[PDB]
Amino acid sequence: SDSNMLLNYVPVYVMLPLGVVNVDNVFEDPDGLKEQLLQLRAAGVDGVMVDVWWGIIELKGPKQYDWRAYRSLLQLVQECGLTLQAIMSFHQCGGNVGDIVNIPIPQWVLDIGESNHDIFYTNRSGTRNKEYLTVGVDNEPIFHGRTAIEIYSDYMKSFRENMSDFLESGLIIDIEVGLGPAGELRYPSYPQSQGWEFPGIGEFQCYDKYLKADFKAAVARAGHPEWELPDDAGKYNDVPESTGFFKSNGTYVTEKGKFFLTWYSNKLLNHGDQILDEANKAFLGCKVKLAIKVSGIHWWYKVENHAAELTAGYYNLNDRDGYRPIARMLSRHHAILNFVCLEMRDSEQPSDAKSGPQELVQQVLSGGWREDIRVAGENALPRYDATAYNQIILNARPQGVNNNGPPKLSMFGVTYLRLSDDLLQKSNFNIFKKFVLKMHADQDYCANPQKYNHAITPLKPSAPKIPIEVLLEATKPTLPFPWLPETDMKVDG
């Protein structure tokens, strides 16, 4: 049982509290965090995840980085016997679910935004979302001579060099490369800041002047210079059948609508690819893996228009796989797909949301495995209950434990949202400890990940670029891998 069981081990990470380093670049409560981290260590947790906030670190001005508070944080994590998942967080904290602290992007960038409002994702009404720089400015040299991708590149390089000792020592297991709002490769199509409420369809975020011009040039090249961006897609809180765009036989299935949706979703593929190229250059030779985050847009998954996925930039339909192209893009970077809505069951969602989180998880994970990449995940919402943990464990090993060897299917890791005093209360923490144990296939905590075939080797160069047509060959629908109806390693087991 034991070593066969150890090859079934799926590591568990815990997100740190938001604002552990505050907006003033102060590590405010090391002593309190220490006590919490030592509890996690004794509970068997493998490591922790933290946002390395751009708006904290590069606040003073371009290339004026202050890494000192984060060095103190990393030092503490190391002392407490935990590894670290470091998010390169190029986004704002404050306007998404659960955000309890306010960390804008650097003021010097916002200053440029006051003169050029088109550096922000923009909806049809003209509202500027300041949480992330539009993909439109990725390669526009408008930030005191740098492009947005150069900013991100320079930041990652500075992190790699200034944290070189922690990297060499093996503290950092993965670099989560932030690619949009909430760190995710997506558009801000469901902004609470503009009055969105679940389960609204959301809105397309491509009306900044850079994206609009790019679209207009592309439709002209396609022989349709008169095509305009969608004007019949409704508003954030609509339902799909209320809109010309998403109704049955609506604009989304027309040649115009299909072209738009392809263009819009391709912008994210290319944004992720180009930024991961820079991440690979920055961390070349380091014993880390790269990861990206994919949001779980489960509402409207069960209707043919998938409207909320579409407005988020995931062009996923019943007959078009919008996620497997992302997995294929990751393959050349040897990168992890971290899918950030892992814990849900369909029965938890209201019927009117047409919500399919179980099936969405199965689709995304299956696509990653079909494309021979590693797949990780997170719970979306705070959960302390056995139903949630058993669903996570199911997704972690969807065909169960292999008593005879490694499992044919397993996730590469799960990161739990989030460390809080509530997690550490007696009953909640007791159930969490059982979750960890079952994720670990009933084995004790295993400090050396080589033992469970998660050795960390130096980051190699990315493989050659994959052209967009080859990436989009992965839109071909495929059957998912079969899932058990329940895990064989329940917490109450």
Ligand SMILES: OC[C@H]1O[C@H](O[C@H]2[C@H](O)[C@@H](O)[C@@H](O)O[C@@H]2CO)[C@H](O)[C@@H](O)[C@@H]1O
């Ligand atoms: O980008 C943030 C977060 O958005 C989604 O979370 C949803 C959640 O699934 C809904 O049930 C509801 O609570 O609204 C949340 C958004 O405010 C994604 O599911 C998640 O993956 C992503 O991190």
Ligand SMILES: OC[C@H]1O[C@H](O[C@H]2[C@H](O)[C@@H](O)[C@@H](O)O[C@@H]2CO)[C@H](O)[C@@H](O)[C@@H]1O
């Ligand atoms: O600290 C990580 C990340 O947390 C929040 O975003 C979450 C979202 O709340 C979830 O639903 C989840 O599992 O995925 C997102 C990505 O981890 C903050 O909103 C975000 O700013 C922060 O980076």
